Amino acid sequence: TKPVHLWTKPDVADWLESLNWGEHKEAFMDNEIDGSHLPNLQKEDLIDLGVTRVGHRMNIERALKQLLD
Amino acid sequence: TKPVHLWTKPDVADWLESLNWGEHKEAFMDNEIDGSHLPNLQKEDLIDLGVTRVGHRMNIERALKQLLDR
Amino acid sequence: TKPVHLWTKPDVADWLESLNWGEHKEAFMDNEIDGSHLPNLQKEDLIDLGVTRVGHRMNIERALKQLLD
Amino acid sequence: TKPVHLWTKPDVADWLESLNWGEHKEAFMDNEIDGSHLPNLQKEDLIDLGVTRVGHRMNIERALKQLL
Amino acid sequence: TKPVHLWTKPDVADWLESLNWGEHKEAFMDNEIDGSHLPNLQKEDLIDLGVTRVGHRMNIERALKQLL
Amino acid sequence: KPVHLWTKPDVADWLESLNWGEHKEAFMDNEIDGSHLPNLQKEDLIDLGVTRVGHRMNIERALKQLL
Ligand SMILES: [Cl-]
Ligand SMILES: [Cl-]
């Protein structure tokens, strides 16, 4: 399995789609988010990426932290 | 009773109604608040969820801390 | 290569181009960024310089570390 | 969205791949094609870039104008 | 993994070991430190818990700020 | 199957079996089959997209055992 730190920008878009978060793939792509960034995103980054719903963002944050395992 | 961390989004709405805070049901549901979020909500989160009255917000903050010992 | 602390303002523009970041030349030049400033550039500075896209900004922060560290 | 006129040479390569036209990334990269050029390429430019199959080139020309 | 606010006292012990700070397990255990307390510990709490070396304490404070 | 008869899909299955599926596409794209697998050197693996150092040495180790 490809490790997260090597995921490309399309790999990140595929990850979002796998979790039914494709609504954010355009913003993540336009902001050039790849796997070297993904597990290190903070609350303010996700707001800048258009993730605004409180519980929704906390869910994404949780999933992001899990990628560190 | 169900532990807080397993509360669904409807379960959280039920909790708000139990404490006569049903005015915030819609915002909590639209923001997908479930029990895995409740004890970690901070002032700014509550403001984003429409809890703007000062003393009212403080009362909710107290009830959230209480979830840690229920 | 010329040491970074000696880089002129055009030297910083060349570096931006060398990494396909020429879209930021005008802002860096207008703000008078030279080599003596590159080790002091923080996130807020880069945002002031027009680097707003999230992953793109973290890519520039990474390259600055690679250039100087 | 990043405007086309600011696409870098890698951005153009990624665009080619995205449309399964990756066979031409090397030529576009070697010829320093970026977003400032992409929407202005003509038939003869595309031929110089290795895009020789007729219908295939016509499809790229169609996409290049939809970038606008 | 498990959210920090749910961590039991043994869970906090496991976290300390995971960062090679096992010298502080029994003190954290005896003081009944669990996840509900962990992120809110201050300098004087850590000193009360036996975390005395300056840099070593700053390192623990940094990790605490990260689990939160 | 013996290794030197492995098809391109056979090599892909091998990578999958070792949870190295991230290299399926490049190995398939580069037309790697059993007749090539044993003769792959460090620079061939790099050309095939194998950049993690220790991981690459793990693959090289398995390629020898494949013999
Ligand atoms: Cl062609
Ligand atoms: Cl690799």
Residue numbers in the entry:
A (entry chain A), C (entry chain C): 1780 to 1848
B (entry chain B): 1780 to 1849
D (entry chain D), E (entry chain E): 1780 to 1847
F (entry chain F): 1781 to 1847
What did the publication describing this PDB structure actually write?
Postsynaptic scaffold proteins such as Shank, PSD-95, Homer and SAPAP/GKAP family members establish the postsynaptic density of glutamatergic synapses through a dense network of molecular interactions. This enables the formation of large sheets where Shank proteins multimerize, allowing Shank proteins to serve as building blocks in deeper layers of the PSD.
After one round of optimization, crystals were obtained that diffracted to 1.95 Å. Structural comparison between the crystals structures of WT and of the L1800W mutant SAM domains shows that the bulky side chain of the Trp induces a shift of the C-terminal helix, locating it further away from the Zn2+ cluster. This shift places H1835 about 2.0 Å away from the position observed for SAM WT. Furthermore, H1835 adopts a different conformation for its side chain, as well as the side chain of R1832. As a result, the Zn2+ binding site is altered or possibly destroyed. As a result, Zn2+ affinity is reduced to the effect that no Zn2+ is found in the mutant protein, whereas WT SAM domain keeps partially attached to its bound Zn2+ during the purification and crystallization procedure. The p.L1800W variant severely delays the kinetics of Zn2+-dependent polymerization of the Shank2-SAM domain.
